[PDB]
Amino acid sequence: MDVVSLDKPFMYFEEIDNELDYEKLPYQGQLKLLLGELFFLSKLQRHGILDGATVVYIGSAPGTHIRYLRDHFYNLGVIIKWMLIDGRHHDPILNGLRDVTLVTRFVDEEYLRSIKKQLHPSKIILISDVRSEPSTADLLSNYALQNVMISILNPVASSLKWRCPFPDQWIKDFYIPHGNKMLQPFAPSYSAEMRLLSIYTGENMRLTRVTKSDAVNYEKKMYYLNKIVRNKVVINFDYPNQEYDYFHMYFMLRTVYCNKTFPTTKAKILFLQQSIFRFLNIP
Ligand SMILES: Nc1ncnc2c1ncn2[C@@H]1O[C@H](C[C@@H](N)CC[C@H](N)C(=O)O)[C@@H](O)[C@H]1O
């Protein structure tokens, strides 16, 4: 790989500063979700709005990684209820947890109102990973449902699956919530998917229009990220693995809270990475 010297990785989509014409690890998908959701919830923990909240995770099955998330915050003493909702059955490793409710159901508008009624007036934190290859109509339906999740559940914060339709498959302009577009380490080699992280103030979710020219910008920026940036070795990075994804993961993991104290920040991240990899059965 090509060597590079970096002070920090690209954490959000806006930071990608170049574009390029578009042209491995075991169970990487669970690792990708685990890192992004740890980053999202740890950010909420820093703001002091995670404690006392109920995390409603829609599209959570199989959700093997969710067991690690729950244990992590449980071992920190953070008071969270988990509500996992999916039409498919969850990983059995989530069984036997009293603070985790497993719901076997595909959510629609009517059901979203019911769960809001039972959880109200408690704080709701929304995580959506629903997916129905997917067509642009499938994505538009998914993003429409995620908008309905926010307008009905009215969460204090949300993490939403966000991948813009390809410009050569455009149908119509559509609307998505305001938020920060978190980039995902250990995503598929050429995935353009990101997570939309939103914290709602005055609970007025302002919607932004997405256009075909936005789709072109997403495609070219993400291809540059996947083809060039993620194939670099960060030679100044002090870590056993200097590949960009580990450099990217390192910066996400240093937002995580830990009960254990460590002599150095590197030791903490190394411990966290070993812990996450061991649970997910990654060498
Ligand atoms: N309307 C819906 N309500 C709930 N779950 C849905 C809906 N549409 C699709 N899904 C689920 O979304 C899931 C998509 C998965 N890629 C999610 C993986 C999951 N987040 C994991 O941690 O392993 C599937 O299990 C679908 O059953």
- In short, whether 112's Cβ falls inside 6 Å of ligand 1 is no
The resolution in angstroms reads: 2.0
- What's the rounded Cα separation, in Å, for the pair 21 and 234? 24
Phi, psi of 106, deg, nearest 5? -85, 125
Sign of CA dihedral 271, 273, 274, 278: positive
- In short, whether 151's Cβ falls inside 6 Å of ligand 1 is no
Q: Which atom of ligand 1 is nearest to the CA of 88?
A: 27
Which method was it determined by?
X-ray
- In short, whether 94's Cβ falls inside 6 Å of ligand 1 is no
Mark residue 108 as left, alpha or beta (left: phi above 0; alpha: psi -120 to 50; beta: remaining).
Answer: beta
* Contact between 170 and 140 (Cβ < 8 Å): no
For 253, half-sphere exposure in the C-beta direction (CA atoms, 13 angstrom radius) is: 24
How many angstroms is it from 62 CA to the middle of ligand 1? 8
How many angstroms is it from 127 CA to the middle of ligand 1? 11
* Contact between 55 and 80 (Cβ < 8 Å): yes
List, as own/partner pairs, every contact residues 214-221 make where C-beta atoms lie below 8 angstroms and the sequence separation is at least 24, other chains included. Answer: 214/164, 215/164, 215/165, 215/166, 215/167, 215/170, 216/167, 217/19, 218/13, 218/164, 218/192, 219/22, 219/164, 219/166, 219/167, 219/192, 220/19, 220/20, 220/21, 220/22, 221/13, 221/16, 221/18, 221/19
- What's the rounded Cα separation, in Å, for the pair 222 and 220? 6
Residue 126's closest CA among 207, 226, 220, 200? 200
Specify whether 161 is catalytic.
yes
